[PDB]
RNA sequence: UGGAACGAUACAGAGAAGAUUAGCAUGGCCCCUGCGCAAGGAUGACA
RNA sequence: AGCUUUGCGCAGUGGCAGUAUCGUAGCCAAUGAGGUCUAUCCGAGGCGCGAUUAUUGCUAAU
RNA sequence: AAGGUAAGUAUCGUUCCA
């Protein structure tokens, strides 16, 4: 993803909207949830700095924080649910969209 | 819809008031331009009342 | 207090003015009084 | 810890772990087969699994 | 209108431009199960990209028609006890101010467990003339003390 | 060797000035939390039984549950059989 | 602990190296002292955690307690106050079927928010006090990471 | 209706004693205590409250 | 089970009810060797420290103390009775019996829930409190 | 639409509830402008009863809009938050009655009032005295109308009277909740 | 005194000026505390002068600093107590070596030059 | 000679001095040697604090709050004058 | 949950009789849960209204 | 006369969930200003 | 004589944040605390525990 | 057969029982 990309913000907008879909239906928020929403809305407020951070993460970041795990039980098998660091979720989502 | 797009890809007002020892400060009556189709729209809730007003 | 023998003249229960209950007729023994 | 106390505690842990594994798998079998189980039973069984 | 698997109403959608740059959306919707705890019944589609593929306005119309209409349902309710002149011009307060304020306060789980069931009491009252009946709940009756 | 205390302006031994600065600025409200929780635990009453009571209760439980303890198995509530 | 141990062992290694460069303590007194310090730090790091008391749950609260009020309380009341868009969503009309919005999860109706039943003629403007905000320490992490 | 109050004396002695130099050395603490005659410590009287007692005692003399 | 304090004779349990004013006395009547009583005498273990502020737990063996069997109906294998300031606090469950919890449960949160509800309703000065959960079923499905 | 964007009002209060409805349509293009109704019977209908105010409109052959300034020079020496309070007290008093209000407003025989400003030119302490007099006049009128001694009216209901709050008890028999 | 292996060891007259300069460089963010950071500054060639303490019992842990200064032609001087040097540097812990670096247009240039001159005439 | 304690204990000692002064002042006020501190009020707080009492006599209330402001500023200015070299 | 599959499985539901029986059973379970939530003793009748 | 058990009317009955909400100042960060302390820089001056 | 730099004090005005402040006769720490980018480089506090209405007081109602 | 006891404060009657 180049520094000057025509669709650069469009992919960021889609990634932020997707990350916010998990909270689109919500009435009460935990601390980590509040911080996540803060991160998406800040990245919406300052798209250029957020995308520069994303490019730096994609170019020079190789050490990541531990990602939590739990399981949702379908009573037949167990589906693993992974929780990822809130800031890295934005970078991962933008990368996925691109 | 944009004809190049396929399945896979406001309240105007004639009046206008000019700003500026005498307490009386009368202002001129100015008539304005016309309003074209605006990109901003749909900032209305409870249509069944606003339509009745208009 | 804990770790003390019971008084000789103490009524084992109801001494605190407790009131028993009869949820049903079957449960418990006969009143016999 | 003394080695006899440690040996006994290891044996306790091994026995309770064997029972834990067997009970978790049996409860999972009950749930998948469609048997009638409690909500807290499901929560504890999911934790064990 | 409301026809075609990518519903025609999607063409007029506000974000139609940005959804043009949304590719592989169905795949990530399918994999959403591994990121969010609660399973999505509509994993196979996405309401933005092809619209909702079902309509319930006719279903609710026919349910109201079969249940007896506004008066045929309100006869079962406590509506006539409230004595509103007509059923128009009314709204439901889904949350009392006191309990919605309590929702955010520092509450021990005991109070919260007994607070989430407040909507279950106004429901019981609103259908009391039907639930509290002799035909149903057969058995003896007891009157309130006062 | 003598130094000057930055807080009191009095001659002090050079060897102590480190812990002198550590302790002469001892925060006054710290003293209560040092002397408050300890009093709470001093006046606190225990919740579980004394160890001898656990031992006695364990003996009494072993008296009944012969399906686990003892060598002569009997009923769940029976003393011996 | 290896990295934390690597730093300490390399520090004591250079402490012994500077001694050995000028050929002092050839019998290893400073080397033994440094090894003793390293081992003391090591078995202090590997020491098991101490006794931690399990504090009991707080007792249920009494009737009332006096509280302070000012700019902080005003901002708390602003953050947790019923925004007009929030309070308009709680009202849910009466006898007005609406198309089930948000296909993926029904039972999420906005009520009078954007409803032709009642409400203001103008759209309910969004508030700014309820805007999502990041923590101070997290913003500090953002500053350092950049 | 009389004053009958020396509590203001208690506040003034507290505020004077709070501005009284006390050595941070237990040795000095006990040396000064032996100079005046106070015991080294009371049953369960640690060092911080030893210094505090020293301060409270030299508040008078 | 064995960890919680035990009462040996009739006087001790009455004193334990009387020797407290600012908490709730939760007495587990029954037999600590019972499979039922041992099921919940470990739940009462796992929360004894947590509810120290507003609850104290004593255990009683009805065979050792055969003085309250007739008056309080001690014939179910396990019984739980709550006392406040020398007053038996009735609690309304989903079950017909509203004076005791005559079954051993499994979740350590619900018992603290019930104890805290009892304390809350006893500070007001009630005699019958209402449990949050309904025990007219087992929610199994 | 005439005023520049920084001078555009962010909040419009309205005295009469009927006016709440039309503004929202004529403010349909300004969603950020909050239009708030007033329960306060706020005395501005009496603002037109000032001699320098009515005279202009009682004789005018054609409609036009003119600007005024109800704060003559007070903001030179007093904050606006109390300038508005002084204005509202004066207007409540004038609504009560015009003549005695004028007599109070001219404590000095000179009472200099040039056409540059509107209200009489007095400095701070005469403003103190005239405001006290107007407060006494308003409470006296309220006491005469409602047959209650002024002293019994505590400061809260004094503020209610000044702003336009007064309540009655027509549903007095609906006390069965007690 | 305590350590014969003290070549530039200064007395209790210019030690006060040295500690004043250390504190001023602390206020200006113009020093690197610690033997390792002093050595790094000497290696980088930006160190102007380094001050160590003669209380570190294995003095040869810091006796490479005067040799490094001799290599780089950097003034170096000792003090009589590590605790005073550490506390003057702006940290509570005893420091046995600190360095003073460069700054463009520094307000401390005159005083640092004076300190360099004073030390350089004390070697003999 | 003396030693120069670091900025951490600078802040700590300043906090000790200020907390000491605050607690001494509060204890004296609880005794009653001085009146309880009247709430410091500004123009922005004029209607928040005294507004209900400020409606009756607005000019008197603004005169009082400006007098309080002038007293605070005068205390500051003459404190500087007393501390002037 | 019902429309999650019913709009997904549309025509197949007609031919899967066991699915229809399961749907009706689960709807009756929901109704029974609500009725038990109202009162412990299940009613003899209970209106669909 | 003791208490228990017991049968009556009489009284209350919201068996509702709630540490309720206003103001200021401290405390945290930052900026500005005055004043002092410790110092320290550049510079003005012909006769 | 002023100008001016920096630290520390006293106050004043104003802005901003209450998921954070505070304690450390607990421990370790420039003889290196702590290390994700960039590591022959970086390089100051960290940990554990306690207080808490996520600093603490009055006044004010109920 | 159940899962359907509101908890209380009063005088009055009775009866066993100490």
mmCIF file with all atom_site columns, C-alpha atoms in Angstrom, chain G:
data_model
loop_
_atom_site.group_PDB
_atom_site.id
_atom_site.type_symbol
_atom_site.label_atom_id
_atom_site.label_alt_id
_atom_site.label_comp_id
_atom_site.label_asym_id
_atom_site.label_entity_id
_atom_site.label_seq_id
_atom_site.pdbx_PDB_ins_code
_atom_site.Cartn_x
_atom_site.Cartn_y
_atom_site.Cartn_z
_atom_site.occupancy
_atom_site.B_iso_or_equiv
_atom_site.pdbx_formal_charge
_atom_site.auth_seq_id
_atom_site.auth_comp_id
_atom_site.auth_asym_id
_atom_site.auth_atom_id
_atom_site.pdbx_PDB_model_num
ATOM 1   C CA . UNK G 1 1   ? 13.595  -14.272 33.323 1.00 0.00 ? 1   UNK G CA 1
ATOM 2   C CA . UNK G 1 2   ? 16.482  -14.872 30.902 1.00 0.00 ? 2   UNK G CA 1
ATOM 3   C CA . UNK G 1 3   ? 16.538  -11.366 29.402 1.00 0.00 ? 3   UNK G CA 1
ATOM 4   C CA . UNK G 1 4   ? 16.341  -9.798  32.858 1.00 0.00 ? 4   UNK G CA 1
ATOM 5   C CA . UNK G 1 5   ? 19.026  -12.283 33.892 1.00 0.00 ? 5   UNK G CA 1
ATOM 6   C CA . UNK G 1 6   ? 21.082  -11.582 30.769 1.00 0.00 ? 6   UNK G CA 1
ATOM 7   C CA . UNK G 1 7   ? 21.258  -7.863  31.561 1.00 0.00 ? 7   UNK G CA 1
ATOM 8   C CA . UNK G 1 8   ? 22.380  -8.457  35.148 1.00 0.00 ? 8   UNK G CA 1
ATOM 9   C CA . UNK G 1 9   ? 24.906  -11.162 34.273 1.00 0.00 ? 9   UNK G CA 1
ATOM 10  C CA . UNK G 1 10  ? 26.430  -9.014  31.526 1.00 0.00 ? 10  UNK G CA 1
ATOM 11  C CA . UNK G 1 11  ? 26.638  -6.064  33.925 1.00 0.00 ? 11  UNK G CA 1
ATOM 12  C CA . UNK G 1 12  ? 28.485  -8.134  36.516 1.00 0.00 ? 12  UNK G CA 1
ATOM 13  C CA . UNK G 1 13  ? 30.543  -9.612  33.670 1.00 0.00 ? 13  UNK G CA 1
ATOM 14  C CA . UNK G 1 14  ? 31.824  -6.172  32.693 1.00 0.00 ? 14  UNK G CA 1
ATOM 15  C CA . UNK G 1 15  ? 32.340  -5.329  36.368 1.00 0.00 ? 15  UNK G CA 1
ATOM 16  C CA . UNK G 1 16  ? 34.651  -8.347  36.593 1.00 0.00 ? 16  UNK G CA 1
ATOM 17  C CA . UNK G 1 17  ? 36.153  -7.545  33.176 1.00 0.00 ? 17  UNK G CA 1
ATOM 18  C CA . UNK G 1 18  ? 37.284  -4.089  34.264 1.00 0.00 ? 18  UNK G CA 1
ATOM 19  C CA . UNK G 1 19  ? 38.931  -5.725  37.284 1.00 0.00 ? 19  UNK G CA 1
ATOM 20  C CA . UNK G 1 20  ? 40.657  -8.391  35.177 1.00 0.00 ? 20  UNK G CA 1
ATOM 21  C CA . UNK G 1 21  ? 41.908  -5.806  32.666 1.00 0.00 ? 21  UNK G CA 1
ATOM 22  C CA . UNK G 1 22  ? 44.228  -4.281  35.282 1.00 0.00 ? 22  UNK G CA 1
ATOM 23  C CA . UNK G 1 23  ? 44.886  -7.670  36.947 1.00 0.00 ? 23  UNK G CA 1
ATOM 24  C CA . UNK G 1 24  ? 43.478  -7.151  40.437 1.00 0.00 ? 24  UNK G CA 1
ATOM 25  C CA . UNK G 1 25  ? 41.864  -9.762  42.687 1.00 0.00 ? 25  UNK G CA 1
ATOM 26  C CA . UNK G 1 26  ? 43.666  -12.522 40.798 1.00 0.00 ? 26  UNK G CA 1
ATOM 27  C CA . UNK G 1 27  ? 42.452  -14.960 43.470 1.00 0.00 ? 27  UNK G CA 1
ATOM 28  C CA . UNK G 1 28  ? 38.868  -14.157 42.460 1.00 0.00 ? 28  UNK G CA 1
ATOM 29  C CA . UNK G 1 29  ? 37.527  -12.350 45.533 1.00 0.00 ? 29  UNK G CA 1
ATOM 30  C CA . UNK G 1 30  ? 35.718  -9.760  43.412 1.00 0.00 ? 30  UNK G CA 1
ATOM 31  C CA . UNK G 1 31  ? 34.648  -12.510 41.017 1.00 0.00 ? 31  UNK G CA 1
ATOM 32  C CA . UNK G 1 32  ? 33.219  -14.559 43.877 1.00 0.00 ? 32  UNK G CA 1
ATOM 33  C CA . UNK G 1 33  ? 31.496  -11.454 45.260 1.00 0.00 ? 33  UNK G CA 1
ATOM 34  C CA . UNK G 1 34  ? 29.909  -10.722 41.875 1.00 0.00 ? 34  UNK G CA 1
ATOM 35  C CA . UNK G 1 35  ? 28.839  -14.360 41.517 1.00 0.00 ? 35  UNK G CA 1
ATOM 36  C CA . UNK G 1 36  ? 27.287  -14.202 44.992 1.00 0.00 ? 36  UNK G CA 1
ATOM 37  C CA . UNK G 1 37  ? 25.391  -11.045 44.026 1.00 0.00 ? 37  UNK G CA 1
ATOM 38  C CA . UNK G 1 38  ? 24.190  -12.668 40.790 1.00 0.00 ? 38  UNK G CA 1
ATOM 39  C CA . UNK G 1 39  ? 22.996  -15.784 42.618 1.00 0.00 ? 39  UNK G CA 1
ATOM 40  C CA . UNK G 1 40  ? 21.258  -13.663 45.261 1.00 0.00 ? 40  UNK G CA 1
ATOM 41  C CA . UNK G 1 41  ? 19.395  -11.718 42.580 1.00 0.00 ? 41  UNK G CA 1
ATOM 42  C CA . UNK G 1 42  ? 18.561  -14.983 40.802 1.00 0.00 ? 42  UNK G CA 1
ATOM 43  C CA . UNK G 1 43  ? 17.081  -16.757 43.818 1.00 0.00 ? 43  UNK G CA 1
ATOM 44  C CA . UNK G 1 44  ? 15.300  -13.535 44.773 1.00 0.00 ? 44  UNK G CA 1
ATOM 45  C CA . UNK G 1 45  ? 13.665  -13.533 41.336 1.00 0.00 ? 45  UNK G CA 1
ATOM 46  C CA . UNK G 1 46  ? 12.784  -17.231 41.634 1.00 0.00 ? 46  UNK G CA 1
ATOM 47  C CA . UNK G 1 47  ? 11.409  -16.814 45.167 1.00 0.00 ? 47  UNK G CA 1
ATOM 48  C CA . UNK G 1 48  ? 7.759   -17.918 45.440 1.00 0.00 ? 48  UNK G CA 1
ATOM 49  C CA . UNK G 1 49  ? 5.132   -15.193 45.817 1.00 0.00 ? 49  UNK G CA 1
ATOM 50  C CA . UNK G 1 50  ? 4.194   -14.200 49.380 1.00 0.00 ? 50  UNK G CA 1
ATOM 51  C CA . UNK G 1 51  ? 0.931   -14.616 51.291 1.00 0.00 ? 51  UNK G CA 1
ATOM 52  C CA . UNK G 1 52  ? -1.837  -12.459 49.804 1.00 0.00 ? 52  UNK G CA 1
ATOM 53  C CA . UNK G 1 53  ? -5.005  -11.968 51.838 1.00 0.00 ? 53  UNK G CA 1
ATOM 54  C CA . UNK G 1 54  ? -8.356  -12.507 50.117 1.00 0.00 ? 54  UNK G CA 1
ATOM 55  C CA . UNK G 1 55  ? -10.313 -9.398  51.065 1.00 0.00 ? 55  UNK G CA 1
ATOM 56  C CA . UNK G 1 56  ? -14.038 -10.031 51.621 1.00 0.00 ? 56  UNK G CA 1
ATOM 57  C CA . UNK G 1 57  ? -16.751 -8.531  49.471 1.00 0.00 ? 57  UNK G CA 1
ATOM 58  C CA . UNK G 1 58  ? -18.004 -5.162  50.767 1.00 0.00 ? 58  UNK G CA 1
ATOM 59  C CA . UNK G 1 59  ? -21.145 -5.191  52.863 1.00 0.00 ? 59  UNK G CA 1
ATOM 60  C CA . UNK G 1 60  ? -24.402 -4.027  51.257 1.00 0.00 ? 60  UNK G CA 1
ATOM 61  C CA . UNK G 1 61  ? -24.714 -0.264  51.484 1.00 0.00 ? 61  UNK G CA 1
ATOM 62  C CA . UNK G 1 62  ? -26.881 1.697   53.911 1.00 0.00 ? 62  UNK G CA 1
ATOM 63  C CA . UNK G 1 63  ? -29.627 4.205   53.128 1.00 0.00 ? 63  UNK G CA 1
ATOM 64  C CA . UNK G 1 64  ? -27.833 7.393   52.111 1.00 0.00 ? 64  UNK G CA 1
ATOM 65  C CA . UNK G 1 65  ? -24.388 8.992   52.025 1.00 0.00 ? 65  UNK G CA 1
ATOM 66  C CA . UNK G 1 66  ? -23.340 12.591  51.443 1.00 0.00 ? 66  UNK G CA 1
ATOM 67  C CA . UNK G 1 67  ? -21.535 13.276  48.165 1.00 0.00 ? 67  UNK G CA 1
ATOM 68  C CA . UNK G 1 68  ? -19.580 16.152  46.664 1.00 0.00 ? 68  UNK G CA 1
ATOM 69  C CA . UNK G 1 69  ? -20.606 18.100  43.589 1.00 0.00 ? 69  UNK G CA 1
ATOM 70  C CA . UNK G 1 70  ? -18.880 20.433  41.155 1.00 0.00 ? 70  UNK G CA 1
ATOM 71  C CA . UNK G 1 71  ? -17.269 20.495  37.722 1.00 0.00 ? 71  UNK G CA 1
ATOM 72  C CA . UNK G 1 72  ? -16.327 16.821  38.060 1.00 0.00 ? 72  UNK G CA 1
ATOM 73  C CA . UNK G 1 73  ? -19.858 15.839  39.062 1.00 0.00 ? 73  UNK G CA 1
ATOM 74  C CA . UNK G 1 74  ? -21.240 18.026  36.272 1.00 0.00 ? 74  UNK G CA 1
ATOM 75  C CA . UNK G 1 75  ? -19.083 16.201  33.726 1.00 0.00 ? 75  UNK G CA 1
ATOM 76  C CA . UNK G 1 76  ? -20.129 12.836  35.176 1.00 0.00 ? 76  UNK G CA 1
ATOM 77  C CA . UNK G 1 77  ? -23.776 13.861  34.822 1.00 0.00 ? 77  UNK G CA 1
ATOM 78  C CA . UNK G 1 78  ? -23.082 15.006  31.256 1.00 0.00 ? 78  UNK G CA 1
ATOM 79  C CA . UNK G 1 79  ? -21.411 11.725  30.269 1.00 0.00 ? 79  UNK G CA 1
ATOM 80  C CA . UNK G 1 80  ? -24.126 9.550   31.836 1.00 0.00 ? 80  UNK G CA 1
ATOM 81  C CA . UNK G 1 81  ? -27.013 11.904  31.091 1.00 0.00 ? 81  UNK G CA 1
ATOM 82  C CA . UNK G 1 82  ? -29.822 10.902  28.760 1.00 0.00 ? 82  UNK G CA 1
ATOM 83  C CA . UNK G 1 83  ? -28.858 12.417  25.426 1.00 0.00 ? 83  UNK G CA 1
ATOM 84  C CA . UNK G 1 84  ? -31.917 13.495  23.463 1.00 0.00 ? 84  UNK G CA 1
ATOM 85  C CA . UNK G 1 85  ? -31.138 10.953  20.746 1.00 0.00 ? 85  UNK G CA 1
ATOM 86  C CA . UNK G 1 86  ? -30.828 8.258   23.425 1.00 0.00 ? 86  UNK G CA 1
ATOM 87  C CA . UNK G 1 87  ? -34.034 9.287   25.199 1.00 0.00 ? 87  UNK G CA 1
ATOM 88  C CA . UNK G 1 88  ? -35.879 9.470   21.874 1.00 0.00 ? 88  UNK G CA 1
ATOM 89  C CA . UNK G 1 89  ? -34.830 5.896   21.089 1.00 0.00 ? 89  UNK G CA 1
ATOM 90  C CA . UNK G 1 90  ? -36.284 4.561   24.350 1.00 0.00 ? 90  UNK G CA 1
ATOM 91  C CA . UNK G 1 91  ? -39.774 5.687   23.333 1.00 0.00 ? 91  UNK G CA 1
ATOM 92  C CA . UNK G 1 92  ? -41.176 2.908   21.152 1.00 0.00 ? 92  UNK G CA 1
ATOM 93  C CA . UNK G 1 93  ? -44.537 4.246   19.874 1.00 0.00 ? 93  UNK G CA 1
ATOM 94  C CA . UNK G 1 94  ? -47.776 2.245   20.106 1.00 0.00 ? 94  UNK G CA 1
ATOM 95  C CA . UNK G 1 95  ? -49.684 0.219   17.536 1.00 0.00 ? 95  UNK G CA 1
ATOM 96  C CA . UNK G 1 96  ? -47.246 1.115   14.738 1.00 0.00 ? 96  UNK G CA 1
ATOM 97  C CA . UNK G 1 97  ? -45.598 -1.857  13.036 1.00 0.00 ? 97  UNK G CA 1
ATOM 98  C CA . UNK G 1 98  ? -42.214 -0.965  11.568 1.00 0.00 ? 98  UNK G CA 1
ATOM 99  C CA . UNK G 1 99  ? -39.983 -2.881  9.186  1.00 0.00 ? 99  UNK G CA 1
ATOM 100 C CA . UNK G 1 100 ? -37.437 -4.870  11.189 1.00 0.00 ? 100 UNK G CA 1
ATOM 101 C CA . UNK G 1 101 ? -34.211 -2.909  10.853 1.00 0.00 ? 101 UNK G CA 1
ATOM 102 C CA . UNK G 1 102 ? -30.836 -4.617  11.333 1.00 0.00 ? 102 UNK G CA 1
ATOM 103 C CA . UNK G 1 103 ? -31.638 -8.018  9.822  1.00 0.00 ? 103 UNK G CA 1
ATOM 104 C CA . UNK G 1 104 ? -28.698 -9.629  11.638 1.00 0.00 ? 104 UNK G CA 1
ATOM 105 C CA . UNK G 1 105 ? -30.371 -8.965  15.012 1.00 0.00 ? 105 UNK G CA 1
ATOM 106 C CA . UNK G 1 106 ? -34.033 -8.003  15.246 1.00 0.00 ? 106 UNK G CA 1
ATOM 107 C CA . UNK G 1 107 ? -35.536 -6.656  18.429 1.00 0.00 ? 107 UNK G CA 1
ATOM 108 C CA . UNK G 1 108 ? -33.342 -3.596  17.806 1.00 0.00 ? 108 UNK G CA 1
ATOM 109 C CA . UNK G 1 109 ? -35.853 -0.898  16.890 1.00 0.00 ? 109 UNK G CA 1
ATOM 110 C CA . UNK G 1 110 ? -35.001 2.774   17.237 1.00 0.00 ? 110 UNK G CA 1
ATOM 111 C CA . UNK G 1 111 ? -38.515 3.635   18.404 1.00 0.00 ? 111 UNK G CA 1
ATOM 112 C CA . UNK G 1 112 ? -39.333 7.298   17.889 1.00 0.00 ? 112 UNK G CA 1
ATOM 113 C CA . UNK G 1 113 ? -35.807 7.979   16.591 1.00 0.00 ? 113 UNK G CA 1
ATOM 114 C CA . UNK G 1 114 ? -36.425 8.701   12.922 1.00 0.00 ? 114 UNK G CA 1
ATOM 115 C CA . UNK G 1 115 ? -40.086 7.684   13.254 1.00 0.00 ? 115 UNK G CA 1
ATOM 116 C CA . UNK G 1 116 ? -43.046 9.455   11.642 1.00 0.00 ? 116 UNK G CA 1
ATOM 117 C CA . UNK G 1 117 ? -45.217 8.852   14.717 1.00 0.00 ? 117 UNK G CA 1
ATOM 118 C CA . UNK G 1 118 ? -43.994 11.669  16.963 1.00 0.00 ? 118 UNK G CA 1
ATOM 119 C CA . UNK G 1 119 ? -40.882 13.669  17.746 1.00 0.00 ? 119 UNK G CA 1
ATOM 120 C CA . UNK G 1 120 ? -39.224 16.828  16.511 1.00 0.00 ? 120 UNK G CA 1
ATOM 121 C CA . UNK G 1 121 ? -39.589 18.083  12.945 1.00 0.00 ? 121 UNK G CA 1
ATOM 122 C CA . UNK G 1 122 ? -35.833 18.552  12.673 1.00 0.00 ? 122 UNK G CA 1
ATOM 123 C CA . UNK G 1 123 ? -33.605 15.510  13.005 1.00 0.00 ? 123 UNK G CA 1
ATOM 124 C CA . UNK G 1 124 ? -32.301 14.898  16.523 1.00 0.00 ? 124 UNK G CA 1
ATOM 125 C CA . UNK G 1 125 ? -28.809 16.380  16.349 1.00 0.00 ? 125 UNK G CA 1
ATOM 126 C CA . UNK G 1 126 ? -25.974 14.217  17.645 1.00 0.00 ? 126 UNK G CA 1
ATOM 127 C CA . UNK G 1 127 ? -24.382 15.168  20.962 1.00 0.00 ? 127 UNK G CA 1
ATOM 128 C CA . UNK G 1 128 ? -20.655 15.708  21.503 1.00 0.00 ? 128 UNK G CA 1
ATOM 129 C CA . UNK G 1 129 ? -20.262 14.892  25.209 1.00 0.00 ? 129 UNK G CA 1
ATOM 130 C CA . UNK G 1 130 ? -20.897 11.188  24.536 1.00 0.00 ? 130 UNK G CA 1
ATOM 131 C CA . UNK G 1 131 ? -18.101 10.927  21.950 1.00 0.00 ? 131 UNK G CA 1
ATOM 132 C CA . UNK G 1 132 ? -15.854 7.924   22.528 1.00 0.00 ? 132 UNK G CA 1
ATOM 133 C CA . UNK G 1 133 ? -12.552 8.803   24.181 1.00 0.00 ? 133 UNK G CA 1
ATOM 134 C CA . UNK G 1 134 ? -9.312  6.925   24.770 1.00 0.00 ? 134 UNK G CA 1
ATOM 135 C CA . UNK G 1 135 ? -7.551  6.583   28.110 1.00 0.00 ? 135 UNK G CA 1
ATOM 136 C CA . UNK G 1 136 ? -4.633  8.747   29.196 1.00 0.00 ? 136 UNK G CA 1
ATOM 137 C CA . UNK G 1 137 ? -2.171  5.854   29.463 1.00 0.00 ? 137 UNK G CA 1
ATOM 138 C CA . UNK G 1 138 ? -3.304  4.450   26.116 1.00 0.00 ? 138 UNK G CA 1
ATOM 139 C CA . UNK G 1 139 ? -2.788  7.829   24.452 1.00 0.00 ? 139 UNK G CA 1
ATOM 140 C CA . UNK G 1 140 ? 0.637   7.843   26.107 1.00 0.00 ? 140 UNK G CA 1
ATOM 141 C CA . UNK G 1 141 ? 1.316   4.502   24.408 1.00 0.00 ? 141 UNK G CA 1
ATOM 142 C CA . UNK G 1 142 ? 0.225   6.081   21.119 1.00 0.00 ? 142 UNK G CA 1
ATOM 143 C CA . UNK G 1 143 ? 2.667   8.966   21.623 1.00 0.00 ? 143 UNK G CA 1
ATOM 144 C CA . UNK G 1 144 ? 5.599   6.662   22.391 1.00 0.00 ? 144 UNK G CA 1
ATOM 145 C CA . UNK G 1 145 ? 4.814   4.217   19.577 1.00 0.00 ? 145 UNK G CA 1
ATOM 146 C CA . UNK G 1 146 ? 5.004   7.178   17.182 1.00 0.00 ? 146 UNK G CA 1
#
